[PDB]
C-alpha positions as MATLAB code, in Angstrom:
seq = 'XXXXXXXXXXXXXXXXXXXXXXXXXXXXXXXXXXXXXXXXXXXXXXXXXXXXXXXXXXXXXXXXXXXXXXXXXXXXXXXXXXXXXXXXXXXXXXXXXXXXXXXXXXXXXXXXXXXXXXXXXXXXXXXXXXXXXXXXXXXXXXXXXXXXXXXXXXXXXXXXXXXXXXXXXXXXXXXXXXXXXXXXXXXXXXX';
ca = [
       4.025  205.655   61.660;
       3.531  204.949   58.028;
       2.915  200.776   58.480;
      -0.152  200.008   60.856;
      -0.866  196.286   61.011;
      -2.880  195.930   64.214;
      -5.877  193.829   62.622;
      -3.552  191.540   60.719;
      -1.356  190.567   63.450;
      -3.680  191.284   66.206;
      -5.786  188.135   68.868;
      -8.836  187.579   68.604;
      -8.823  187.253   71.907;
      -7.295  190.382   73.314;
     -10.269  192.267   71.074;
      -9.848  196.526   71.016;
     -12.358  199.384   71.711;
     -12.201  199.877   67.972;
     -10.505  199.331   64.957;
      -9.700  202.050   62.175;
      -9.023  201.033   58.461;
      -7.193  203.705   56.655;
      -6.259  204.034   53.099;
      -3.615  206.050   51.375;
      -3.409  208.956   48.796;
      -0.924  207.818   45.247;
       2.137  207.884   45.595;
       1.873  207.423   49.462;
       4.743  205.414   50.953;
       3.952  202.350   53.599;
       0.236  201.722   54.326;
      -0.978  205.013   55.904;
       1.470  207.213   54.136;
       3.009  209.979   55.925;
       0.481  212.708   55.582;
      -3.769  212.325   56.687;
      -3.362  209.084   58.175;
      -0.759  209.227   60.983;
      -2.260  212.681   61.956;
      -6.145  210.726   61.973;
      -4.545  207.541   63.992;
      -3.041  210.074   66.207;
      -6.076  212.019   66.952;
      -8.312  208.789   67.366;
      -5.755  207.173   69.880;
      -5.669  210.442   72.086;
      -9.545  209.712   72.746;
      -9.531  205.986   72.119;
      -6.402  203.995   73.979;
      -7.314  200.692   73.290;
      -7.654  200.414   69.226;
      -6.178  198.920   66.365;
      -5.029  200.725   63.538;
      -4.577  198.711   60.247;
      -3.281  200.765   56.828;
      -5.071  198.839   53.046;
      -1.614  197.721   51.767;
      -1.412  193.779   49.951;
      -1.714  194.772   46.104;
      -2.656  198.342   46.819;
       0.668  200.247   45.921;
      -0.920  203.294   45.222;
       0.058  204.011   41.779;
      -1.433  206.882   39.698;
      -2.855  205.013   36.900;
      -5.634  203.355   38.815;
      -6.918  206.720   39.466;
      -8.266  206.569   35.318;
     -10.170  203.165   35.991;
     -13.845  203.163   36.775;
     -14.595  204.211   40.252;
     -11.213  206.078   40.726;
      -9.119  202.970   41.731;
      -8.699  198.886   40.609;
     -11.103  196.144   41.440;
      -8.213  194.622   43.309;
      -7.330  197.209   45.296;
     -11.089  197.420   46.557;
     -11.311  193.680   46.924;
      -8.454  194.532   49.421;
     -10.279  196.612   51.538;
     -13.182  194.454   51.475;
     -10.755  191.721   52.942;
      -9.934  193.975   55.736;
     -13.224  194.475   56.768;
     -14.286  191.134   56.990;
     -11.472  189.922   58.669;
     -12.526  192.706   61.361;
     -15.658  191.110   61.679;
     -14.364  187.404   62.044;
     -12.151  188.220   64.788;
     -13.474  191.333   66.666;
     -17.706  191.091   65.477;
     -18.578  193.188   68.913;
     -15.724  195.847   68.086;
     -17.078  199.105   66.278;
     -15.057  199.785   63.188;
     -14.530  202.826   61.328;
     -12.899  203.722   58.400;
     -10.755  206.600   56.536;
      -9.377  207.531   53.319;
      -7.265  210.072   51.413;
      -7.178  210.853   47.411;
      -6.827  207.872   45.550;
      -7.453  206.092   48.811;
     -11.103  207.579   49.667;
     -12.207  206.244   46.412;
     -10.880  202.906   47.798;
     -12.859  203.067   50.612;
     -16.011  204.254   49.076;
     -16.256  201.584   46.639;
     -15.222  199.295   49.446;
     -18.001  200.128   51.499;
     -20.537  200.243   49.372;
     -20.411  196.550   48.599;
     -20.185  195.047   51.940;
     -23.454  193.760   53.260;
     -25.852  192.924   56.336;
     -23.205  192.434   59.352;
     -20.272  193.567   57.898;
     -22.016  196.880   57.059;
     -23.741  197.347   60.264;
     -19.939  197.007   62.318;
     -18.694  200.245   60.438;
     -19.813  202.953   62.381;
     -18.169  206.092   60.432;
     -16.205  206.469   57.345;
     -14.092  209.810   57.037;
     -12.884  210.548   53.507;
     -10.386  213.362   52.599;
     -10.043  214.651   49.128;
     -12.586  212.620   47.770;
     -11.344  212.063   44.154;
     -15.301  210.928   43.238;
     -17.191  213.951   45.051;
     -18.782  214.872   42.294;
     -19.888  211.552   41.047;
     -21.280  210.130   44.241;
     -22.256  213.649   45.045;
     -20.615  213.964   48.349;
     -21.647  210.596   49.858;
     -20.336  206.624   49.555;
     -23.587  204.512   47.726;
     -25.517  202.282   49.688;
     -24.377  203.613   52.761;
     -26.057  206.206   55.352;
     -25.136  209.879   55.108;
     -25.379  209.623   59.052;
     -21.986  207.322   59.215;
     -20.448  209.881   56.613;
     -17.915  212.895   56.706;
     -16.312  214.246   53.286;
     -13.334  216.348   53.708;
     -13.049  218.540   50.157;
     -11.614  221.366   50.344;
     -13.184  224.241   47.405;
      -9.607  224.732   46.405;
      -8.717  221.210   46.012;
      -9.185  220.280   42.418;
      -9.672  216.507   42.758;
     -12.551  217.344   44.529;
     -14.373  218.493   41.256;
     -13.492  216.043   38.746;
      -9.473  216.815   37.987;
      -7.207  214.587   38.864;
      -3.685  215.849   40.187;
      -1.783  215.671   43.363;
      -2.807  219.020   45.129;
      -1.153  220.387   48.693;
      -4.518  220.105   49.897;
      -3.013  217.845   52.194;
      -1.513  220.803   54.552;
      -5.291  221.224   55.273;
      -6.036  217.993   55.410;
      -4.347  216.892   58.242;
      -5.620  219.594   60.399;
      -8.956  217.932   60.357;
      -7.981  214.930   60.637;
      -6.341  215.119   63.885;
      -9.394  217.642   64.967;
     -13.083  217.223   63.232;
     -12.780  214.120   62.241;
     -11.259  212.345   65.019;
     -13.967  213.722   66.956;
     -16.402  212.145   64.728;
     -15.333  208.877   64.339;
     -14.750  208.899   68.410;
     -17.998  209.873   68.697;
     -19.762  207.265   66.428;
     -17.198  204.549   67.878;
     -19.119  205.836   71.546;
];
């Protein structure tokens, strides 16, 4: 499963018990990749039948330069997300929403975040972020958003999660949680 689209092509009318956006680490292939976000979609769905799972593709290709611009990833690429959020809120503004990211792509959804306001906020119930490549900068939370609604996966031995940025196999841990923890914790904010 590395192409979700279930918010793009899904009805209005035929509205879910959630939806989960879900951004990619660099170099990721599709628009969940192949490694944290199939294993988090997976873990949601086992508690959650009736969701939508949509991946942050359009001009997000996940390349490894944009991890050198300001806030770990482009202006488009965040625009993007913010796209996807409000489009969850114009068709499906009763459905709880929560959110993911992975490497380049938790930076993506930080930033993303942190800009939405009022409504569009309120709908996204939990954010889990995995290898958060701007840990240290945000210390450990996404700005303008509640710590509550917030669970940072970083690893000690993963070395984006103190400033350096490389691909690490941090991943392998990674997916653990994501199909376990947080799973859990997005189920339980979505309830």
């Amino acid at each position: 499963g590395a192409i979700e689209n279930g918010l793009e092509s899904g009805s209005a009318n035929a509205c879910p018990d959630a939806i989960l956006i879900f951004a990619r680490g660099s170099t990721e292939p599709g628009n969940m990749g192949i490694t944290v976000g199939p294993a988090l979609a997976n873990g949601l769905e086992s508690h959650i039948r009736n969701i939508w799972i949509q991946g942050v593709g359009g001009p997000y290709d996940a390349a490894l330069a944009t991890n050198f611009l300001p806030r770990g990833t482009s202006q488009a690429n965040i625009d993007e997300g913010k796209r996807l959020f409000a489009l969850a809120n114009q068709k499906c503004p009763n459905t709880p929403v929560v959110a993911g990211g992975y490497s380049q792509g938790a930076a993506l959804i930080a930033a993303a975040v942190s800009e939405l306001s009022g409504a569009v906020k309120e709908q996204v119930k939990g954010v889990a972020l995995f290898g958060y490549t701007q840990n240290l900068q945000n210390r450990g939370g996404i700005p303008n958003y509640p710590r509550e609604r917030t669970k940072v996966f970083c690893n000690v031995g993963d070395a984006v999660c103190t400033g350096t940025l490389i691909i690490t196999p941090a991943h392998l841990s990674y997916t653990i949680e994501a199909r376990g923890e947080a799973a859990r914790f997005l189920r339980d904010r979505i309830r």
